[PDB]
Amino acid sequence: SVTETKEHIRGLGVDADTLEPRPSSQGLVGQEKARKAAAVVLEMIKQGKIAGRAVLIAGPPSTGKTAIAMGMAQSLGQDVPFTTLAASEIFSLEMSKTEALTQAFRKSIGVRIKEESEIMEGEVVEIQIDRGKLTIKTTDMEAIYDMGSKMIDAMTKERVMAGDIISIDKSSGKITKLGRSYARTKFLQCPEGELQKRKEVVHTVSLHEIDVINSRTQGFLALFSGDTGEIRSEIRDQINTKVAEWKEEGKAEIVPGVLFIDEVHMLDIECFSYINRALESDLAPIVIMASNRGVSRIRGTDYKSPHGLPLDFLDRVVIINTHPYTPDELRQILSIRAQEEEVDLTPDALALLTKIGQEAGLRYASNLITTSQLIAAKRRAKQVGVEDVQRSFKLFYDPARSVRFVQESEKRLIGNDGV
Amino acid sequence: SVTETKEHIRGLGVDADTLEPRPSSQGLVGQEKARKAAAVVLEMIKQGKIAGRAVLIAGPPSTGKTAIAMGMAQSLGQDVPFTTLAASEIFSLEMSKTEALTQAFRKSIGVRIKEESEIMEGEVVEIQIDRGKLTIKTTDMEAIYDMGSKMIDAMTKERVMAGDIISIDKSSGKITKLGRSYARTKFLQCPEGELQKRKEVVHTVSLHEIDVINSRTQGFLALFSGDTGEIRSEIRDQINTKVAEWKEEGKAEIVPGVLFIDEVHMLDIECFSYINRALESDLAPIVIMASNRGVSRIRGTDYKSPHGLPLDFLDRVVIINTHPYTPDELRQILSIRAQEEEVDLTPDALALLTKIGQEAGLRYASNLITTSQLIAAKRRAKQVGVEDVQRSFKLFYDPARSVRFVQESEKRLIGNDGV
Amino acid sequence: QISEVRGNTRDHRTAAHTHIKGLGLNSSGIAEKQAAGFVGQCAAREACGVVVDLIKAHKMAGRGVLLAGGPGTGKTALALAISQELGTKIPFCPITGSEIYSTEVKKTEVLMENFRRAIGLRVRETKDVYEGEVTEMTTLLIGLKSARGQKKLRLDPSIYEAIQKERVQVGDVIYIETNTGRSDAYATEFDLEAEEYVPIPKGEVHKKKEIVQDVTLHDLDVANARPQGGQDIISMMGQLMKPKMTEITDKLRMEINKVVQKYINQGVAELIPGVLFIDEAHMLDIECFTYLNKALESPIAPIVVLASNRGIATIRGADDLKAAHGIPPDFLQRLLIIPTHPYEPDEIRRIVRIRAQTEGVQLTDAAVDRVAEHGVRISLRYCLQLLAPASILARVNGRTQVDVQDIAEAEELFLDARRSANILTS
Amino acid sequence: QISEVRGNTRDHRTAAHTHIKGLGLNSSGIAEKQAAGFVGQCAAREACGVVVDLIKAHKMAGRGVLLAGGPGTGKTALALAISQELGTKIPFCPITGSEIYSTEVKKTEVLMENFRRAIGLRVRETKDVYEGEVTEMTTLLIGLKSARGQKKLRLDPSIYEAIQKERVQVGDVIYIETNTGRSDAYATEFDLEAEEYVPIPKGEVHKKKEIVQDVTLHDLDVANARPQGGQDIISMMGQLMKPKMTEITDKLRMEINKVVQKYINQGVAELIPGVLFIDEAHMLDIECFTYLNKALESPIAPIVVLASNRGIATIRGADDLKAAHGIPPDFLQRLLIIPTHPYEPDEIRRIVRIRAQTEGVQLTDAAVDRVAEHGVRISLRYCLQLLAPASILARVNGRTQVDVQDIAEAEELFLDARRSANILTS
Amino acid sequence: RVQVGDVIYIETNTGRSDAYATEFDLEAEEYVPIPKGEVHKKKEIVQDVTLHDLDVANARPQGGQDIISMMGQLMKPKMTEITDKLR
Ligand SMILES: Nc1ncnc2c1ncn2[C@@H]1O[C@H](COP(=O)(O)OP(=O)(O)O)[C@@H](O)[C@H]1O
Ligand SMILES: Nc1ncnc2c1ncn2[C@@H]1O[C@H](COP(=O)(O)OP(=O)(O)O)[C@@H](O)[C@H]1O
């Protein structure tokens, strides 16, 4: 079929009228300065003289800068393209730098049209797991449907389960939770009549998805074959002219999304030239970049600057900054990611993970959640305790301990320093 | 049509029999050692065992070494090819290193033949300027002729004006001042009969000009189109065989000219290989090189030598040296370049330009002449005074003051040194 | 190829200089402080005046300008003022040397594109043509028809003998050049094509129209990069459409030049060279400066203004050879170097007021002082950016007029480059 | 392809060694000072003698020579003397390692060209042929005619049966190999072509000519690089004609070798390997020495003499690995290293006298002393150059005999490399 | 395309000159000879011919003689010189 531009966080967590950030509702956690700074940038974008500027989010690793970008993406609205790209992924054998950058940008520009489709609406009954099958009914009929990996993902993302009244677009596979029939959020009543109805609906698809749709479908096991992932220019030219025609006609509307480039210090002068040329088109999305470096080398030259951006670029970008989470914030984040992975922690366990999160970082602390879950399971323990978080901490090292441990083979002292 | 090999200085300014240089007649100014050294080299070339050697002219910037090369070129005679090439111009996207070097050398090798042509001879009446139209007459008729950029150049170069008896080759556009009808140098009488006569004349054209003539004429705005400037080998082969045939027949005679390569320290090992291979042909011109460096790196290798020439090359070259002009010489040079740009200076003004020329160099001092001229004009001043040379000195900086000024943003002391 | 064309200029680049309307100089070439949008910097302005005068006097023989100074100075603004002083609708193409570093285009291929953006074409031709289907052919009276309207003409013998040349009879569709074909109506359903049938000129019998248009060589290029049957996708979604820009070809450019020279020959159009401004000039390499050297020689080329805020830098394309501003000697020789000074706090406060009244955001006198202190601390660039956010933070709690509290929070929400790094370093 | 060919040697390179006529050694292989053009340096000369003897004895199994010493030494001169001692008309190809660095040719493509310059071909065949139109065919008497001249021959039965093989009758144009066709006259205007008609041998009825010629493999290459209908442009204007030299092709070289082997098989020609001398050997890279290693193995290859005035240098093509003279170990192993010494003032004065009497410029005994002191101060190279200018400065005020005043002004008009730099540095 | 001095034609009722050519030009060339040897040409064309006279006249290329009217039938069996396109 196709795929709509819905590919967790609902917003910036900010007062609609004050732009003052409530700490955790949307929910982002902490980073109130950076989130209010984001709200201002958005208000600057929504209408004003921002005029084709990138956004730089600088801060330590495992801050909330990646999440803020999505928080910025949602504030613009659902069905508004949000694509994330690690700057290093631009360098591969699958495709050239120019190609990868084009796909990334075209993934962030959505084409919106009104067309009829077969949408489903009913109350969920059952959902299954494998190494699925959705049972849905109305007041008139019940049905069982089969589905694959891509399908099961979007549903678990939209947080769906038995008792939820949902809406499935058979043409794009877009799931939408309308409400609930009973408790186990909006209390709606079960849909009446036909389970499947043909309705006129708005479809928003990226320029890249359209390119993919009109290309020879990628073969099974594409990754491990030598097959490249570039898109034929003749196909793009075909898609560009038709999208330009639809815009002139009125059939289509262009919806600029958000392109978030992480570890942007990996880009070279040539990459920044492209990003500069792209931002000069009206169709251009909001380019948001994130760096973990204080000062870095400008790749492509022998010049160093803050975050490793060309001095020209830095004069154009809007810089937002993030900071280390407070222990309370870490404790709140890890507790959230624990229930999302379905892990029952002990108050002590969470406390140790928080202390671990301080010492080694949020991502590392997060990794230890699932390993601890399995250790508790091997134990048959009723709940994930501190005894398990400690044992996983001794089994799986973080980067700092790892490099120290490997350096331990060639050591420098017993009574004093030696070399 | 075509263009003859006349593309300011009439000689070395040297005693014809002593080789002792009169200071300024030809006129070059000063550099008497270097000019006498040049005269010896020429006498060595004219007949003897010089045997395919390049000439290196080393000395500080804005000396007379560029002018001496032309002074050497004229001593060989008019209609003897003289081409000047900045070593860095060899590096471009328009053409390869080998191509640029071939054109440069072929620009310095002239093909001389006797053929009939339509030459004009008459007394000039008027000359005009635009953003021209030559009126010429004889004792039998008068005529008005239109002309373009290339034409107006050659005339102003030959120093022509109303009252001059001149000669214009309608086939090559070669202007020749025969004399004068009245005062405003040889006092000749006005030409009689037909204004245009068909005569047998010697035409000397470079191998490159012939190549250009037999190629598709360069399109208008050629520079700003992507058009390359190389010459098709099939065209060269055509020109080479015919020139070889004309030489065998006796129709043509090869006239080796002078190739002057400035800032020769920009050439790499590969460039010096070419220049070495070219000098091994009988048709090879006199290669004259000029460097501003004491010691430089041999580009293409990790070896350093005087002027940046391969140690092999240095053992073959004849080295002439120039020195800083004396204040009197600077004063004489700047006064000459002032009347040539049509600037009326005050004795004080010239004095300050000379002091400026000492401090910042001859080229910089020269630049300040025209800027001062315009400042005096804005003032409506009758003559260019010191008040104008001073104001242009404060407005337009030289390189030394410029780098110091830009360094001024990050300064190193107020009470003492800081860093 | 088409004569009338649209032009999409990159106005993002001169958006921070919308107040600069000129250099603001006296009749005697002396700078007036706080005139034409400028504030102080009188020396650089007066210097530009000499440059503008040298250009108009054609005394600028194969030379260029170099603006040396720090970031906060008025380097780009000065260049813009130069193009303005050089006349009306003069092309201005500002770039940075870092732009020419492209993945799928050579460094000079990029420079050449920009040269075309800085070369304008003033077209001031008036075309008067009486067209339509012929109705009479008789002291020579010829008639013409249009959709709604009919004119009977009075011709001289000279035109009816030039009409004897062109295939013309009654009633066909014809064109008339005042200064210098089967009609659609007679077509039968049985003809189809190939056909000789064309529509009658609708809906005027005359056409004394005046053609007034100014465009750059690049506007012509892009206009003819689309075929009949497609839209202007290049200026709609330029870089995003595909990796490599194959639409603008060499053959296409030389066809433009071939056409451009034709309009000039007919005294219809004059091509007016503008101003090509290149920031971060030290980013160019030797091959780039070799191209620029050739440009400086051409009579029909834009004035080349360079800028740099580096005193000494390695000449790119050379073996660690350092020179003034990163410019090679062979090229630096041809430049009039104009130095730009930093600004006094009172000069900075004035500039901020000018910018704010242009945005235009209203702010207190205390706010202006706070914004200018960042113009001293950091560049004039950074502090000027603080206006937008503070205005938003005001309006949100507005209190529409901006205060010090607003600039205070804005300076904490949006750090400058140097701060952001040194804070992250810790 | 043609047998007889012209050879244009690069005599610019051995112009400074026109006095070197040999090594000047005794019958016992001991060097005589100031003999054969040489002066002192007896050790290197005697060493070369052993090399020349090892070569003639074929004991030089896959080995080469390396001349180690300073600039002023007799390195290039020694190599030239080696080729001379190796026999008559022995090929000598001197080059510098810096030459192989070409823009449009690979480093070894250049070496290979020079190997061909150092491989000679001695052709000593005597061809005797009786040609012309046949007139008689009868103890076998056959007649022949020429432009002016007629011969009646006396043939044996063995040739008239070999003549029975070739298409031969009276009267046709025929060729006769002593040791081992319609005549032009019968052509009618009505025939045209294709034709079988050829001219009668003008203007001799016989041809017992002796072919005596010595040429290098490169002389053959260039000779056949021109087609019938063109001139010898390659040796007229070699490098100047065009950037890339496409005339000499692989197929052309192997056709030469195919022909060269044929002449050898017929005992007509012997190919004589000469001397390939390469200065600045440290300029070669690993890929160059790999080629030279293969060369040293071949029996039909020129003796490879290398020279270097560097004690230790980085092996090019290796990761900053330094070795003796810049030569790799795998190759240095195959070299007999001969060291060249600097010269005493009296040795230098003698050399200058020899050179001056060769130029030949006459100069005083005081002049010789002044020129030799620059042979000590600077190289023997620089001071020897001072002769020409001084001779000119003399002759101009001549006073044709050169004096000290002349060398005095010449040394001030023409500085050496080191002086010119250090003076400019200031 | 007209300027001084080029070779031009004038129709009363209704180009580089050969002189300026240089030996270095060759071709392709824009050079043509000057009209020899009259500066005017008010000539009267008076001729009567059949359609067949035109046919045969153009049956020969520049570089050949009038062989058709010299030895019509004898030159060859089939007369392929006069073609439909030519008529
Ligand atoms: N003298 C001045 N008068 C008014 N505005 C100025 C002046 N100098 C700089 N500006 C403004 O301050 C900002 C500095 O930018 P710009 O001149 O482009 O700096 P750069 O030196 O980096 O090119 C711009 O908004 C510019 O319009
Ligand atoms: N022993 C010698 N006897 C005579 N002439 C010599 C002697 N040694 C060197 N020369 C001459 O001195 C000059 C030095 O050049 P050359 O031998 O080629 O030096 P290099 O060591 O650099 O190869 C040449 O003119 C050479 O003929």
Author numbering:
A (entry chain B), B (entry chain B): 8 to 14, 26 to 149, 158 to 210, 221 to 455
C (entry chain A), D (entry chain A): 3 to 140, 157 to 198, 205 to 450
E (entry chain A): 185 to 198, 205 to 277
Article excerpt on this structure:
Rvb1 and Rvb2 are highly conserved eukaryotic proteins, very similar to each other, that belong to the large AAA+ (ATPases associated with diverse cellular activities) superfamily of ATPases. Rvb1 and Rvb2 (also known as RuvBL1/RuvBL2, Pontin/Reptin, TIP49a/TIP49b) are necessary for cell viability and play essential roles in various complexes involved in fundamental processes such as transcription regulation, DNA damage response and apoptosis (via the chromatin remodelling complexes SWR1, INO80 and TIP60), maturation of small nuclear ribonucleoproteins, cellular development, cancer metastasis and regulation of mitosis. Domain II (DII) corresponds to an insertion of 160–170 amino acids in domain DI between the Walker A and B motifs that is unique to Rvb1 and Rvb2 in comparison with other AAA+ family members. Here, we report the crystal structure of the dodecameric Rvb1/Rvb2 complex from Chaetomium thermophilum (Ct) at 2.9 and 3 Å resolution in two nucleotide binding states (ADP/ADP and ADP/PP) together with two cryo-EM reconstructions of the same complex in the stretched and compact conformation at 21 and 12 Å resolution.
Therefore, the complex structure was solved using selenomethionine (SeMet) substituted proteins in a single anomalous dispersion (SAD) experiment and subsequently refined to Rwork/Rfree values of 23.0/25.6%. The Rvb1/Rvb2 complex crystallized in space group H32 with one Rvb1/Rvb2 heterodimer in the asymmetric unit. We will therefore refer to this state as ADP/PP. In contrast, we observe subtle changes in the case of Rvb2. Finally, the “trans-arginine finger” Arg358 of Rvb1 that protrudes into the Rvb2 nucleotide binding pocket stabilizes both the ADP and the PP state. Despite some missing residues in the sulphate-bound Rvb2, this tail has a similar position as in the ADP-bound Rvb1.
